[PDB]
Amino acid sequence: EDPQLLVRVRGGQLRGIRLKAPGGPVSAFLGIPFAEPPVGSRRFMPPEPKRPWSGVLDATTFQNVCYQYVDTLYPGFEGTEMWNPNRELSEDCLYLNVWTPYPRPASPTPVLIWIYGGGFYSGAASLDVYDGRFLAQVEGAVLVSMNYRVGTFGFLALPGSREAPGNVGLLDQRLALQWVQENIAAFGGDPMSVTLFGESAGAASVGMHILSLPSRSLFHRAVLQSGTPNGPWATVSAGEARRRATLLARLVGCNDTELIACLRTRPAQDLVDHEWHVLPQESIFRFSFVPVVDGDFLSDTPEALINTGDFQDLQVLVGVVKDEGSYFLVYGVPGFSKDNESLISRAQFLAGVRIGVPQASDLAAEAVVLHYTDWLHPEDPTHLRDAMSAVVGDHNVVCPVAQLAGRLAAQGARVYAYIFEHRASTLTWPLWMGVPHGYEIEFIFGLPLDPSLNYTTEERIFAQRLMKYWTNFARTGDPNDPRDSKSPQWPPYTTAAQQYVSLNLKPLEVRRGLRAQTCAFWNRFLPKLLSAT
């Protein structure tokens, strides 16, 4: 037996597996339980630490995926299926995965912890695009990723109740973070250098660990890709969460205690079947069961917490892709399809806006339409299509990111910002969607280094650059290569200069102002307008 693949953790012994990366072997420990299975009476409850086990636990394979909705928009299409569960569904899903170099690091190595996205309703740490072997082999990183409960199972809340207090999926993440503190040194990981990174809902989660004190002692740096804790979709008020929960109960034939008891008798798929039916309006980029402002995990709204927080000892890397909104349009806006160029009329654009900005009053929706219309080409379908994408991307991601970056920088944080502008040569979505939400991930994780994936050689060089930025950020809080003696360097984002860089096949270019004018509209004007309409 290979002693490199044998680790003792607090819970007992486990056996990992030696995997091939293009440049060498890595050690992988997959399917490690970090919690008691949250099943039966444990449904909707906070996670509890996994009890110890006898003998040697088999950690050579990915564990089940947390119970979730499965996308059927384009059955069998690679672009959608790549996000779908790639293992069996189960509520027994609280496991994490660790990749280290082979052999085990001689000295304590910086840890990256990945938190998957998926709108808080889906996702899994076992997807191919989250494969940690490349970062492990090439950058010598210790990489961790955990499953956490999504949908009703992770976020259904009757605020105040003992049996569905909300945010349990965030607690799953936190428990995993605790597990890393207590165990990662056994793998050669350094618990004094832990960097969280995540995309979309994963980024929002990272943001919430920043804004929740008990998490703060479990990591040192953060990366938020295309997602924030502030903004329109990442959280709900207690009242809205309570509302969605009792509506769901009503929908499945179900006093908090009684209501939750009856929900607990329901087969998992019965809950999933009605998950989407509780949203207050017809919308896109909106998810039924998400973190709730409980006054506990989140002591106040993310907006309020970023405004008043002290972030002096924090380093954050945040960024967006070129076309944040395009992906979501095919999931609710009439006129949009992956199978044509989605050229839309003016009427369709106005209709699309009420759906993309579902909380907007008539006047607010009018403001949006008039801001985004190109008055030189008010009825041009190509521009109306691209504007619809921009409305969704800006409202949900770009402007919330700009707001976050600004508050963090102003309040002591060291911040680096990017925009990712390279569209994968292997992308299966149409050209009109550009660089869609989620398609920087395969580059950060270094998938183009696998020659069987048919990425171009420029893309391989690109991926290697990104892996260096991310790992260097993990190691130091500064994504700049300490061996690169060339201008330009990646400068910190500040409120004065507002510098950020473009990530693409060309060398780093420095830009100023992350949609400054348009985000002033979203971040400064619209709230005034809503609180008056």
Ligand X SMILES: CCN1CCC[C@H]1CNC(=O)c1cc([N+](=O)[O-])c(N(C)C)cc1OC
Ligand Y SMILES: *[C@@H]1O[C@H](CO)[C@@H](O)[C@H](O)[C@H]1NC(C)=O
Can you give the binding site for ligand Y, defined by CB under 6 A?
Answer: 335, 337, 339-343, 453-454
Segment near ligand X (CB under 6 A); pick from 235-243, 327-335, 358-366, 405-413: 327-335
DSSP three-state, residue 49: strand
Q: CB 140 → ligand X: shortest distance, Å?
A: 30
Of 33, 363, 479, 493, the residue at the interface with its own copies (CB under 8 A) is 363
SS3 59: coil
Question: 240 catalytic, yes or no?
Answer: no
In angstroms, the Cα distances linking 502 to 417, 420, 441, 499, 507 are 9, 6, 16, 10, 9
Secondary structure of residue 372 in the 3-state scheme: helix
User: Regarding beta strands 89-90 and 109-115, do their DSSP bridges make them parallel or antiparallel, or are they unpaired?
Assistant: unpaired
Least separation in angstroms between residue 254's CB and ligand X is: 23
HSE-CB at 73 with a 13 A cutoff on CA atoms is 19
Rounded to 5°, the CA angle 79-205-167 comes to 115
d(CA 276, CA 279): 6
Binding ligand X (rule: CB under 6 A), the pick from 104, 149, 242, 286 is 286
Question: 328 contacts which partner out of ligand Y, ligand X, its own copies, none, CB within 5 to 8 A by kind?
Answer: ligand X
The footprint of ligand X on residues 224-283 (CB under 6 A) is: 276, 283
Contact flags string 16-55 toward ligand X, x per CB under 6 A: ----------------------------------------
Catalytic position from the list 122, 200, 215, 389: 200
**Which stretch, 158-166, 173-181, 219-227, 284-292, contacts ligand X (CB under 6 A)?**
284-292
Using the Cα atoms of residue 218, residue 222, residue 226 and residue 229 in order, give the sign of their dihedral: positive
Q: State the minimum distance, in angstroms, from the CB of residue 446 to its own copies.
A: 35
Interacting span for its own copies (CB under 8 A) from 139-147, 283-291, 327-335, 366-374 = 366-374
3-state secondary structure of 191: strand
532's contact among its own copies, ligand Y, ligand X, none, with CB below 5 to 8 A by partner kind, is its own copies
> Which listed residue (139, 275, 303, 324) is catalytic?
324
CB 89 within 8 A of CB 170: no
What amino acid is encoded at 309 in this protein? Answer: G
Q: How far is CA 379 from the centre of its chain?
A: 35
Instruction: Note the helical H segments in 38-109.
Output: 78-81
Please work out the total of residues on this chain that contact its own copies, with binding judged by CB under 8 A.
Answer: 22
* Amino acid identity, position 412: G
Which of 290, 367, 405, 419 is close enough to bind its own copies by CB under 8 A? 367
Provide, rounded to whole angstroms, the least separation between the CB of residue 392 and ligand X: 8
Active site residue 324: yes
Residues from 60 through 99 that contact ligand X (CB under 6 A) = 71, 73, 83
Piece of 167-175, 258-266, 324-332, 495-503 that binds ligand X (CB under 6 A): 324-332
Q: Which does 327 bind (CB under 5 to 8 A by kind): ligand Y, ligand X, its own copies, none?
A: ligand X
- 117: CB partners within 8 A, 6+ apart: 123, 198, 199, 200, 201, 202, 203, 226, 227, 438
CB atoms within 10 A of CB 350: 16
> Do 188 and 108 touch, CB atoms closer than 8 A?
yes
Q: Which is nearer to ligand X, 189 or 202 (CB)?
A: 202
Report if residue 380 touches its own copies, rule: CB under 8 A.
no
For residue 314, the SS3 value is coil
Q: Which does 129 bind (CB under 5 to 8 A by kind): ligand Y, its own copies, ligand X, none?
A: none
Interface mask toward its own copies for 504-523; x: CB under 8 A: --------xx--xx-xxx--
Please pick, among 220, 383, 395, 437, the residue that the annotation labels catalytic.
437
DSSP per-residue letters across 403-467: HHHHHHHHTT-EEEEEEE-PPPTT--S-GGG-SBTTTTHHHHTTGGG-GGG---HHHHHHHHHHH
Which of ligand Y, ligand X, its own copies, none binds 286 (CB below 5-8 Å, type-dependent)? ligand X
The DSSP call for residue 84 is S
Q: Which does 342 bind (CB under 5 to 8 A by kind): ligand X, ligand Y, its own copies, none?
A: ligand Y
Query: Which residues of this chain interact with ligand X, rule CB under 6 A?
Result: 71, 73, 83, 118-119, 276, 283-286, 327-328, 331-332, 437-438
Catalytic center residues: 200, 324, 437
Footprint on this chain of its own copies (rule: CB under 8 A): 363, 366-367, 370, 373-376, 498, 512-513, 516-517, 519-521, 524-525, 528-529, 532-533
